[PDB]
Design a protein around this nucleic acid. Structure first.
Ligand code: DZ4
Ligand code: MG
Ligand code: MG
Length: 428
DNA sequence: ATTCCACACT
DNA sequence: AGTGTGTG
């Protein structure tokens, strides 16, 4: 009763850019705007691999991981933009710089946690408290929430158009709000959504990029909410919406349950939906999935999660890798050294820029390889000191730490992947 | 022949 | 450390 926490203590948003690499390319090249379009890496093998897809192209069935030649079978007029290639590999610099544009705008509203190249979590609890004090008991107009969906509404007794439904649900929600009581979680989420509308408007005005967002009480629900009405919309998932939302929600849709652990939850417990987890005791879940996973699942299926929005706007590592599939696997010592150099040169360029922008220096170099035949993504990891931002030195050091893996002037078994990653940053 | 960050476990 | 999972 009065002592059961409900995980309604925070307001958390997740902002995720819509078809992000495609929008970067469409901003640059107006000929690509409002067209079925995709971004590809490489070109020689089957037209290149698609990594981002405009919503117009998705309507034809084009997806990420598809070869462009195959995508063109579904969508003959598909337009393509190619990722920059430097030193023999795809180079994502343009998208990292566009990401910085967006993250710097978001950081004006609140502390953000950079969760990927195109998304960040936002802890809005304080901003909401401030805005509720500014508001002075004044009701919130639907005009302040022009692109917001309230998950679960409308319910109960222009209904056949999407925007009509969005407005009906929003009206039900605002009609129900207690705009007195500044401690109401639903009111806090609603003010959060007002702020997120402002944040998304700022991103679009100042960059040209559209994005979606989720607003809820924690990161998992915010992330889930964001995807519910992409693109160019935001979704509020209230605590009270959780039981119905989760009652038909496949377990794999919840962040960190998309892989083996989620599969084992389904297999061991014989369930399909997140809500079914509520029927197990915390001890039962811990016995199957461990203390940490069990406690997390027990709270998460009730809409409760405590993972904090970490104050971290910058990546903690700077890495780059290249695959060498099938017959292209590296089979000579010289080949291995040349590609280690190419990777080290990209890494040096990125590290030097990072040191100037962010007042820090990496202190450890991590080298990872994959050998032909190994089913695992990475076969071996080794590390060494990173004492100078020098590509020739870094590539020589990586070779020194991996050369004894060579069973064999010849390299055996051939290498199917190289990976250099700078880690352990200290202030400079 | 999909390609190119963060964190748990031991 | 080094291995592995999950993410986007
Ligand atoms: N598996 C992958 N391999 C390579 N690049 C990838 C990738 N997944 C994503 N990227 C890159 C390319 C993506 O543009 C960018 C953001 O990833 P998302 O947010 O998952 N997908 P998007 O923003 O495109 O569409 P929307 O959010 O509207 O569904 O990261
Ligand atoms: Mg996105
Ligand atoms: Mg994303």
């Amino acid at each position: 009763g009065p002592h059961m926490a409900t995980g309604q203590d925070r307001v958390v948003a997740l902002v995720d850019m819509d078809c992000f690499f495609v929008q970067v390319e469409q901003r640059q090249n107006p000929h690509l705007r409002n067209k079925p379009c995709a971004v590809v890496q490489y070109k020689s093998w089957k037209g290149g691999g698609i990594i981002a897809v405009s919503y117009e192209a998705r309507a034809f069935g084009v997806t990420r991981s598809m070869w462009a030649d195959d995508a063109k079978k579904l969508c003959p007029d598909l337009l393509l933009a190619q990722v920059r290639e430097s030193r023999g590999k795809a180079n994502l610099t343009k998208y990292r710089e566009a990401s910085v544009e967006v993250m710097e705008i978001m950081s004006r509203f609140a502390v953000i946690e950079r969760a990927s190249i195109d998304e960040a979590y936002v802890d809005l609890t304080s901003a909401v408290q401030e805005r509720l004090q500014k508001l002075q008991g004044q009701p919130i107009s639907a005009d302040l929430l022009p692109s917001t969906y309230i998950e679960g509404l409308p319910q109960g007794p222009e209904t056949v158009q999407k925007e009509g439904m969005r407005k009906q649900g929003l009206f039900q929600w605002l009609d129900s709000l207690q705009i007195d009581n500044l401690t109401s979680p639903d009111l806090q989420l609603t003010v959060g959504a007002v702020i997120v509308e402002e944040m998304r408007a700022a991103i679009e005005r100042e960059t040209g990029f559209q994005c979606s967002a989720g607003i809820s009480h924690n990161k998992v629900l915010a992330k889930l909410a964001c995807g519910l009405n992409k693109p160019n919309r935001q979704t509020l998932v209230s605590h009270g919406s959780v039981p119905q939302l989760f009652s038909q929600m496949p377990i794999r849709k919840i962040r960190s349950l998309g892989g083996k652990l989620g599969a084992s939850v389904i297999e061991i417990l014989g369930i399909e939906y997140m809500g079914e987890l509520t029927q197990f005791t915390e001890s039962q879940l811990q016995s199957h999935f461990g203390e940490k996973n069990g406690s997390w699942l027990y709270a998460m299926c009730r809409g409760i999660e405590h993972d904090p929005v970490k104050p971290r706007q910058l990546p903690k590592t700077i890495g780059c890798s290249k695959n060498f599939p099938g017959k292209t696997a590296l089979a000579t010592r010289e080949q291995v050294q040349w590609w280690l150099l190419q990777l080290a040169q990209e890494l040096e360029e990125r590290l030097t820029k990072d040191r100037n922008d962010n007042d820090r220096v990496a202190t450890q170099l991590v080298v990872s390889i994959r050998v032909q035949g190994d089913k695992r993504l990475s076969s071996l990891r080794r590390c060494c000191a990173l004492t100078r931002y020098d590509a020739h030195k870094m590539s020589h050091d990586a070779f020194t730490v991996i050369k004894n893996c060579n069973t064999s002037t010849e390299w055996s078994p051939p290498l199917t992947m190289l990976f250099l990653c700078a880690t352990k940053f200290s202030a400079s």
